[model samples]
Target: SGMELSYRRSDLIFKRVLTSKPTWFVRLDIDGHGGQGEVSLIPGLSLDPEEQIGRELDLLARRLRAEEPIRLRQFLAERGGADFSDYRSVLTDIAGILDSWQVSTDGRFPALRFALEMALLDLLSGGRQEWFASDFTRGEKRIPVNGLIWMGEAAFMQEQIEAKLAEGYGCLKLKIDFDKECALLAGIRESFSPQQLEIRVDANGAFSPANAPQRLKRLSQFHLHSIEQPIRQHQWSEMAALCANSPLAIALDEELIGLGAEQRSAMLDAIRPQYIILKPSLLGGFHYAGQWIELARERGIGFWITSALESNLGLAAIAQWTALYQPTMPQGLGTGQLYTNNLPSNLAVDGGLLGV
Candidate 1:
């Protein structure tokens, strides 16, 4: 006869990262007796070496053995105290523990550790799904989503943009680090009506300090919602100066990563971009993203959450958080379908709306 059992265990299940296409994804599975399990995928900013992955996995095993969800939360609070109310605090504490255990940022160790930290927090919060939701007003069940059209050959990009429009996506995010600006912008402008769509362009640090100001000025007439990272992250001074002068609203993307407590605060004070693109994975996971939000709010800087093309498991956690926040702007999260083997669930997109 079959038997029913309820038990929870943590393991580092490896799957390939489809976006960065890393060797594998380090996942944590919490299985219920009914053959159903909740899977959480960790986000990694960079790929880790092979041998390091095994050591990190062993470290995670040791942590799983000593501390369960409840114990982890208590340990976090004890280490940081209740005054700690942001992602950085929580992540830092977890990182500290991993460091004490001699776990380096290799393979999936850091990413896995980050996911476990998030899972522990979610469990402590009554399994609410995302830790970043308490601050924003939960909007409608369906939030408008934008399609990201990456930069490519002119003909290819135009085709992709037209396709997104045909599919009923009102907002389009175009990757714009290429040349032939006038022609490209003109082609894009001709394809859609101003009233019919919203456009955002990301340069991914393709522009130089010399060209950014003039280029942004010329591109501003296209009525873009924002231009992201036109210049490199190191050009904060030039970026800030450009924001002050340019007609276009600038959004900071790559500039907001690996920022410690002091650097995080300092960047906000210096750059002061009108919008910030928050990607949980790139900024050290949910906890770090939350701290950035708090800081942005304090400084009156508007922000929208986007994903760095993680798998469905990571995206699901992000979607839950986005739903709870209900941000006014469309989020950049409609990429699960990009994967050949992405496991579809309620979090999948339908008709441009991210289904909750």
Candidate 2:
């Protein structure tokens, strides 16, 4: 019985916080040491926020405190179908073990998987929340992030842009409802040239395949950095045609969710997008995100990481992981300044840079 381990306890708390919905905070204790994670779920975006997640969390807690403690190698062999007798509870190994469970169970709980990954990574790394050994985690560096603007009336959008600019943001992303926001984009372009400010738009798949080309041309007048998911996902041929010929660069956001490596490679090869957005929580946590990154880089496709409105707990984990990559492009990592009574974190955004 060498290298045996299991969580002594797990505590899950649901907080009616705002962005403005809620999140679940999970704490795992092993041998009196504790680590935490945040389950940041979006209503329509996540797999199944209700019944499935509840079942998985309950299953996880029960297994962690079961009558017989988990034998690392035995569990991996029996449940995960792998042999990792040499597993050392490191970040990569622990994430791999959890991912194995995802494969065996076929349970698509990306948010819950991400939370458990965060907890395990933190716990294995001495419960200090130092998931990565990077300059940002050690307080030696800061990551540049873009300011986010939500969809609204022209005046409301303008006010948000002005505040972000005043806060010294050089890059900005707007949640675009093109029918209502086309004029807003026009006005912003009038004041800030492409050289003066980096502009990105997230259409959130508002445009139809037939109308996407025309809408893309309209948005391209502002010389945007890129437009994210202009049309709905699962339309490979339609999206591929747009990505190949659209005036604005195309970034795959929601399209990147729920894909294995084979399908992932097939998508990129067919669509040939300019960029892919990485949301670790939404895309099945860091291990899966790494696979996406690997595939993107192999095809010369660009990528940037974003937060899925996790409490600062998940935010910190994402930011630290991002620092390990040393990204030059401004990441979409800024928390929208308010979450109803969010977790206490050293996370600070100053001059559009996120740091401890």
Candidate 3:
């Protein structure tokens, strides 16, 4: 029950500040209120969040300046009255306003977009970093996460599996490639029953279209939870057919890139995928992420949030947001421990469960 108290200040100065390459920090300083809040944005991670986000810096600074008097209220998803409880309205209004200013990002600057939102929420909550639903807004939520295994020698991979299992991780996810995939997985299958350990793999589109069909059919035997991006995205027909015919589930990872609302709808409807991964920094912000959730639910698709290695700064926001759903599945929130200079955070992992 580490939920942070939401500090409120009616009269506060909103500050838009810059620091480091492709990174910006935001905060709200209340005069003599003994309260302040802050958040950070690190671009150039997934989808090169920097290129998509950081590159827009100069104009973005201007944009924030123009919205000066708005304060952190603009960032809160509160639509309880004349303001913003309607997340949809707030998102559209902000997008339109930003777009009208020649800053029309459309959907290009996800990292910056989400980062801005998170920072504001953090500021709004007096730096508590609150967003999403009840438990998270309360900062009392914890997310489930998988043990990550970086690709390496078969022996190294085996060692990682034992490590995760020893840590009480019931779900194990690994990044795979052409290197001894069959043998490595075969060893895992022998060591544990599928019921004991649910397995998933991310190929990062390693398989070619020509070979995917034959390869996927072969992969079905191991009782995998799923495979991500059998082939790279933009091959709509390729992915469509892949999902339609596969005996196993295929989750769209990279395929979600560069998609607008209409495009996202079209892609999901056309492919009818078993699952789609959501990464807030890469997919815009909480509002856009909400749009995807709505579309996926309308079509009966499953989904889970994945971090784009945006340091704890990005991960914290994504985790707090993901906690709203209280998903039972393991999430890609484990990277909180990955960064050496990771921004210090309350987020922690034990028994493969990520808790804040």
Candidate 4:
């Protein structure tokens, strides 16, 4: 009675609006030196995230909607400027203001902040959403995507796996729980070697650090790519030690939230994870995410972008943003069909690759 994805072989699968929005893309009337930003507004911007998207969004939007004209003037004044580096500074200033007002802290208000960022980016991208002028934007480079297996009875989980296999997915991610987790994983490992199919699992904080190492020992037999957020967030020293001693590489997921550049730098520096997953929507937007990427690289750590089950508009923004880097590990961007009423868009998932 859960997560039965029929993911057949063809290439198909498939969110929200802000107050109001445009087609998948529109040529923005605003101009910039290098790029124009095309915003993808998630109409259903309700935050299931407990840190409070709805509450924080109201706090931020209440302020902005009233001052939209002032905000617009600020945007236009700098948007049409000859310099582009300062745009980053402008976002930083806004973040500071939001931070001071107690609006965007504790991982809250990201949805509202992200909406504003995307719309401004669209205006700057010459309205085509091709702000970076990359192979990804031109549809020349497609990011490799992993097939997703939702939690179900062991029998149904295996069925979903085979369905993805039948659909030609070379990489897969399983939302794992205690319901015969090992047997199910081992079964997939039996049918597909690591080379044939890259397997990644996310425990969603299901394991205790006390027994995590012992549990990972069993998982090590499967030759997995890695496990994401095996334990809950926090527990800095425990995570650092686990990362150092575990047989399997641990990628930090939820742990990256509620952190600023300063906090992010220290956490990555302290824990020294093998990888840190980035969710731009959760971590504010591209600017903060870019900071994490830079910091991770500084520590010689690896990373990949993940879509946080937002609408197609938000997913497209993430796909384009992720294209700036070549993702060797499968990027987690395959949540388009969870809703039936999403707006039509150019992005498509085919043969486990997401592209326009």
Number of backbone collisions per candidate: 3, 1, 7, 20
Q: What is the lDDT of residue 226 in candidate 1?
A: 90
Q: Which stretches of candidate 3 lie over 4 Å from their true place?
A: 1-22, 28-55, 66-104, 136-140, 151-155, 177-179
- Using TM-score, give the best candidate's number: 2
- When 1 and 2 are scored with TM-score, the better candidate is 2
- lDDT, each prediction: 0.64, 0.75, 0.66, 0.67
Q: Which residue runs does candidate 1 get wrong by more than 4 Å? A: 1-20, 23-51, 66-70, 73-110, 121-140, 150-159, 177-179
Model 2 scores a TM of 0.85
> For candidate 1, what is the lDDT?
0.64
lDDT of 3 by residue, 131-199 (tens): 444565454666778877776776777788788889989887877745378777787788788998888
State TM-scores per candidate: 0.74, 0.85, 0.80, 0.76
Deviation in Å, model 2, residue 21 alpha carbon: 3.1
* Cα lDDT of model 1 by residue, 1-356, tens digit: 11121233233333443242432333333322111212223333443343454455555655655544453445544743334555446556665544554443432333444454455455434444544444322434666688877656678977887788788788888777334765787777887676787889888888898988889889888888899888988778998898899899999988886566789889889988998898765565665677788899999999999876566656766766666566667898865455555555555466677765
- Candidate 4 segments whose C-alpha is farther than 4 A from its true place: 1-107, 129-132, 151-158, 177-179
Model 4: number of backbone collisions: 20
Candidate ranking (TM-score, best to worst): 2, 3, 4, 1
Error of 3 at 29 (Å): 5.8
Q: Candidates ranked by lDDT, best first?
A: 2, 4, 3, 1
